[PDB]
């Protein structure tokens, strides 16, 4: 049962629809980015063409072992023709390799699928400025006004300052950052840079980062944990028990852990500004939850949609309940009446 919001009308295209078997009529499967809820179903035994960014294609080949004959990477900001239809991939400001897709239908309809994105004013000067867009398939993850969080710049500044202070006060403190999906790499890269260290991680995480075309990555990451003052761990280990366990394995090199858990929005945001964020502490371990989002805030999403002025909006997130659907449609109507389209 492939949902309608993953189908592109007038085409043989689906978007992020790999867990529904052979979709009837689908001649090309697009993947917006390498996140689990979006590539779900893709495996080494997929035998249909997959269209994606170069970075996403690297991850499909090396992490999911999809055969190269079915991986069709496309450059960004470049008009391409897929099965007789003009398409453009645009940077989504989400995770590495994440794209939005512009479809130019033969009948003149223009469709923008945002994939997952964090709307930014720089998108208002992309190839979208040249385009009337009739249908918008919109990442509505945080489509409610209570969803406020700081800029990525502000969050990284807090993380850098917090880590530099803690390690300058105690040179025997270890910094740990939690990760699961790709994305939010700036958190641990910026901290390692201010500490003059490479980032140590597992072989599997190292493999993943090697696929991301990050400039000078070999100067920034390592599998030699002993040489690193900043360690990556699975997000599930970012707790007092998991961190105590990791500290023991470091052989008495460290006597303190400062850990960061990059989250999306938490209602702590509704009460606390980034400068007033405090950690959870138990003994010699402190855990900071930092609101580093790679999705649009409500205000960022509203600004983007009011600039784009689409004729029709199709939400791709929070579609499962009538309450969420009615809430989002109320906001779309508000935005349209305020802006005048
Ligand atoms: C369990 O934590 C996640 C699982 C899946 C995803 C995800 C994302 C952000 C942040 C967290 C997650 C995301 O952007 N996407 O697409 C995902 O699939
Ligand atoms: C199972 O838990 C998730 C599955 C998918 C997603 C997700 C996210 C946050 C937090 C959790 C999840 C998210 O932001 N996005 O985009 C997702 O697709
Ligand atoms: Ni995502
Ligand atoms: Zn997602």
Residue numbers in the entry: 700 to 1040
Which passages does the manuscript contain on this structure?
Three human ‘MBL-fold’ DNA repair factors, SNM1A, SNM1B (Apollo) and SNM1C (Artemis) are involved in repair of ICLs and DSBs. SNM1A/SNM1B are 5′–3′ exonucleases with the unusual capacity to hydrolyse DNA substrates containing lesions, including ICLs.
The electron density maps reveal both 1 and 2 bind directly to the metal ion(s) via oxygen atoms. The molecule of 1 bound to the M1 site is positioned to hydrogen bond with the main chain amide of D736 and to interact with the side chains of S735, Y879 and S800. The obtained structures reveal both 1 and 2 (and, likely 3) bind directly to the active site metal ion(s) of SNM1A via two oxygen atoms and likely inhibit in a competitive manner with the DNA substrate, displacing the Zn(ii) ion complexed hydrolytic water/hydroxide that, in models of the reaction mechanism, is positioned for hydrolysis of the phosphodiester bond in the DNA backbone. The three rings of 1 and 3 likely contribute to their poor solubility and hence limit their usefulness as inhibitors.
